[PDB]
Scaffold this active site. Sequence first.
Site, PDB file in Angstrom:
ATOM      1  N   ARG A  36       0.813  -1.198   0.000  1.00 22.30           N
ATOM      2  CA  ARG A  36       0.000   0.000   0.000  1.00 22.30           C
ATOM      3  C   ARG A  36       0.855   1.260   0.000  1.00 22.30           C
ATOM      4  O   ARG A  36       2.067   1.208   0.216  1.00 22.30           O
ATOM      5  CB  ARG A  36      -0.857   0.019   1.262  1.00 22.30           C
ATOM      6  CG  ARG A  36      -2.071  -0.899   1.246  1.00 22.30           C
ATOM      7  CD  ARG A  36      -3.286  -0.163   0.707  1.00 22.30           C
ATOM      8  NE  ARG A  36      -4.023   0.427   1.793  1.00 22.30           N
ATOM      9  CZ  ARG A  36      -4.684   1.574   1.787  1.00 22.30           C
ATOM     10  NH1 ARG A  36      -4.760   2.379   0.734  1.00 22.30           N
ATOM     11  NH2 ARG A  36      -5.315   1.891   2.897  1.00 22.30           N
ATOM     12  N   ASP A  61      -3.937  -1.133   8.806  1.00 23.93           N
ATOM     13  CA  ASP A  61      -2.986  -0.073   9.102  1.00 23.93           C
ATOM     14  C   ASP A  61      -2.132  -0.417  10.311  1.00 23.93           C
ATOM     15  O   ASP A  61      -0.936  -0.160  10.310  1.00 23.93           O
ATOM     16  CB  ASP A  61      -3.725   1.240   9.377  1.00 23.93           C
ATOM     17  CG  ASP A  61      -4.539   1.730   8.183  1.00 23.93           C
ATOM     18  OD1 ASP A  61      -4.266   1.313   7.040  1.00 23.93           O
ATOM     19  OD2 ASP A  61      -5.430   2.568   8.401  1.00 23.93           O
ATOM     20  N   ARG A 245      -6.922  15.902   0.719  1.00 21.72           N
ATOM     21  CA  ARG A 245      -7.928  14.857   0.731  1.00 21.72           C
ATOM     22  C   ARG A 245      -9.092  15.358   1.570  1.00 21.72           C
ATOM     23  O   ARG A 245      -8.890  16.017   2.596  1.00 21.72           O
ATOM     24  CB  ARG A 245      -7.359  13.584   1.390  1.00 21.72           C
ATOM     25  CG  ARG A 245      -8.413  12.562   1.768  1.00 21.72           C
ATOM     26  CD  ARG A 245      -7.794  11.342   2.409  1.00 21.72           C
ATOM     27  NE  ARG A 245      -8.810  10.410   2.913  1.00 21.72           N
ATOM     28  CZ  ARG A 245      -8.564   9.154   3.283  1.00 21.72           C
ATOM     29  NH1 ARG A 245      -7.343   8.673   3.196  1.00 21.72           N
ATOM     30  NH2 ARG A 245      -9.536   8.385   3.759  1.00 21.72           N
ATOM     31  N   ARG A 308     -12.935   2.740  -3.884  1.00 20.06           N
ATOM     32  CA  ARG A 308     -12.212   3.786  -4.619  1.00 20.06           C
ATOM     33  C   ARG A 308     -11.847   3.426  -6.067  1.00 20.06           C
ATOM     34  O   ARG A 308     -10.672   3.386  -6.452  1.00 20.06           O
ATOM     35  CB  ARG A 308     -10.949   4.125  -3.820  1.00 20.06           C
ATOM     36  CG  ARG A 308     -11.255   4.779  -2.495  1.00 20.06           C
ATOM     37  CD  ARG A 308     -10.178   4.491  -1.503  1.00 20.06           C
ATOM     38  NE  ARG A 308     -10.304   5.351  -0.334  1.00 20.06           N
ATOM     39  CZ  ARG A 308      -9.503   5.283   0.721  1.00 20.06           C
ATOM     40  NH1 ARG A 308      -8.534   4.383   0.752  1.00 20.06           N
ATOM     41  NH2 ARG A 308      -9.632   6.161   1.705  1.00 20.06           N
ATOM     42  N   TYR A 341      -4.815   4.661  -3.735  1.00 18.82           N
ATOM     43  CA  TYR A 341      -3.682   5.588  -3.683  1.00 18.82           C
ATOM     44  C   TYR A 341      -2.822   5.613  -4.957  1.00 18.82           C
ATOM     45  O   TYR A 341      -2.750   4.626  -5.707  1.00 18.82           O
ATOM     46  CB  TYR A 341      -2.802   5.303  -2.459  1.00 18.82           C
ATOM     47  CG  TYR A 341      -3.377   5.779  -1.145  1.00 18.82           C
ATOM     48  CD1 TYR A 341      -4.755   5.692  -0.878  1.00 18.82           C
ATOM     49  CD2 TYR A 341      -2.551   6.327  -0.164  1.00 18.82           C
ATOM     50  CE1 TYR A 341      -5.293   6.142   0.335  1.00 18.82           C
ATOM     51  CE2 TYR A 341      -3.080   6.777   1.050  1.00 18.82           C
ATOM     52  CZ  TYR A 341      -4.448   6.682   1.284  1.00 18.82           C
ATOM     53  OH  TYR A 341      -4.962   7.143   2.464  1.00 18.82           O
ATOM     54  N   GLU A 360      -2.176   1.734  -6.465  1.00 17.00           N
ATOM     55  CA  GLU A 360      -2.646   0.519  -5.806  1.00 17.00           C
ATOM     56  C   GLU A 360      -3.583  -0.262  -6.709  1.00 17.00           C
ATOM     57  O   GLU A 360      -4.559   0.282  -7.239  1.00 17.00           O
ATOM     58  CB  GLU A 360      -3.350   0.873  -4.499  1.00 17.00           C
ATOM     59  CG  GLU A 360      -2.415   1.496  -3.477  1.00 17.00           C
ATOM     60  CD  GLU A 360      -3.100   1.845  -2.181  1.00 17.00           C
ATOM     61  OE1 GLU A 360      -4.264   2.266  -2.188  1.00 17.00           O
ATOM     62  OE2 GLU A 360      -2.452   1.717  -1.132  1.00 17.00           O
TER      63      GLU A 360
HETATM   64  C1  LIG Z   1      -0.891   6.405   9.569  1.00 10.77           C
HETATM   65  C2  LIG Z   1      -2.191   5.833   9.024  1.00 10.77           C
HETATM   66  O1  LIG Z   1      -3.062   5.388   9.766  1.00 10.77           O
HETATM   67  N1  LIG Z   1      -2.361   5.940   7.706  1.00 10.77           N
HETATM   68  C3  LIG Z   1      -3.552   5.397   7.069  1.00 10.77           C
HETATM   69  C4  LIG Z   1      -4.704   6.417   6.940  1.00 10.77           C
HETATM   70  C5  LIG Z   1      -5.218   7.035   8.217  1.00 10.77           C
HETATM   71  O2  LIG Z   1      -5.593   6.027   9.107  1.00 10.77           O
HETATM   72  C6  LIG Z   1      -6.410   7.978   7.848  1.00 10.77           C
HETATM   73  O3  LIG Z   1      -5.940   8.989   6.975  1.00 10.77           O
HETATM   74  C7  LIG Z   1      -6.994   8.593   9.108  1.00 10.77           C
HETATM   75  O4  LIG Z   1      -5.989   9.361   9.761  1.00 10.77           O
HETATM   76  O5  LIG Z   1      -5.807   5.736   6.289  1.00 10.77           O
HETATM   77  C8  LIG Z   1      -5.563   5.318   4.961  1.00 10.77           C
HETATM   78  P1  LIG Z   1      -7.068   4.730   4.235  1.00 10.77           P
HETATM   79  O6  LIG Z   1      -7.583   3.653   5.235  1.00 10.77           O
HETATM   80  O7  LIG Z   1      -7.968   5.905   4.040  1.00 10.77           O
HETATM   81  O8  LIG Z   1      -6.865   3.969   3.020  1.00 10.77           O
HETATM   82  C9  LIG Z   1      -4.360   4.366   4.894  1.00 10.77           C
HETATM   83  C10 LIG Z   1      -3.139   4.969   5.638  1.00 10.77           C
HETATM   84  O9  LIG Z   1      -2.085   4.016   5.709  1.00 10.77           O
HETATM   85  K   LIG Z   2      -7.522   4.344   8.060  1.00 10.75           K
END
Ligand SMILES: CC(=O)N[C@H]1[C@H]([C@H](O)[C@H](O)CO)O[C@H](P(=O)(O)O)C[C@@H]1O
Ligand SMILES: [K+]
Length: 381
Positions: A36, A61, A245, A308, A341, A360
Amino acid sequence: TVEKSVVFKAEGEHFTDQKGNTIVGSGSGGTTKYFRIPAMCTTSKGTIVVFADARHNTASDQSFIDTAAARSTDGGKTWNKKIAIYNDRVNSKLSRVMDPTCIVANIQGRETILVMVGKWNNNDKTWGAYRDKAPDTDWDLVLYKSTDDGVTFSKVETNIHDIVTKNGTISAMLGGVGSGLQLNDGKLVFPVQMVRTKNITTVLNTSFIYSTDGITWSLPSGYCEGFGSENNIIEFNASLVNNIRNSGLRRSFETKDFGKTWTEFPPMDKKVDNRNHGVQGSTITIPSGNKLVAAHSSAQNKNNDYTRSDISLYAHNLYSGEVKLIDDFYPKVGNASGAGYSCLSYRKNVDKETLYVVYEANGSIEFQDLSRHLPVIKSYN
Ligand SMILES: CC(=O)N[C@H]1[C@H]([C@H](O)[C@H](O)CO)O[C@H](P(=O)(O)O)C[C@@H]1O
Ligand SMILES: [K+]
């Protein structure tokens, strides 16, 4: 170059640790399960360096993650891969380095590739949940550099933790994801996201950190609204403009006083819709004559959810405010486990112009050469 290739294959890569032992992931045959958050930086040698979270066990995550790096010297046809940054390995379930942001720059004459990732070890919840401390004790933001065209990376001893602690109202900070930039004056700029302490009304804010040497960094005095916080910054005349975003329409703000105050930037503000939850997007500038055009990639998200779908390339006319879809390069519904992404990379080496994307694709990271689209993008001014 090649038109399309797979950089990292979900359940098809095997990495070794710093001791030479293989990292046994949850993918078939003990491969890394999911990739990712791609970040890409192209050098003056035409070398393509791609970074991505190597989420060994799950797409979650809060899991075991290392930052993988892939290097191509043949225009993206073949890739040499390895782990660029290893997590601390304190917790086998949660230790991680994640969400890369890279910059390719010439620092005092030396072409350097910088990669910045957030680091955690014991936190089992999303980073935005930790707002009691300044900063969170489990968190850190590390910077690695390569001075040999992406072959080897080494940690940079920085003052980033110090500036965050000194500020006193930041629980954690992370790069904006994707790529940062080197300003016309030579300064290095990483767009950043920050979770504020519990007392601050706004939970998230966006800003940037800057440096002349890549070692000593500074935070400007002001803050931009947070929204979905992931963001990229572009330089436009005497301003820095971000592209953030947001669930629904993306937001774009401009600073004319180097981070002290920010105001809406009409040409890009609320121009692209990512629908439900929002997604990270890549925004860069491409020169055309003595003017500038902004190229952007993000998902159309036709299902209005975490799938997405349709990661697309857009051109933003910075003068008229017009927006045009140039190419829906990944017109597919993504994996809800983690999708959407991308990262664009434009470069003009001598007289050769290249526009590449990395994105991705169902757990894998794919690469596409979008250079055929340059004439159309460049005419948007
Ligand atoms: C550090 C971290 O958590 N980065 C994650 C963020 C984050 O959780 C959100 O931006 C809320 O802060 O989410 C995205 P997503 O789930 O939208 O695809 C994946 C990232 O790897
Ligand atoms: K997240």
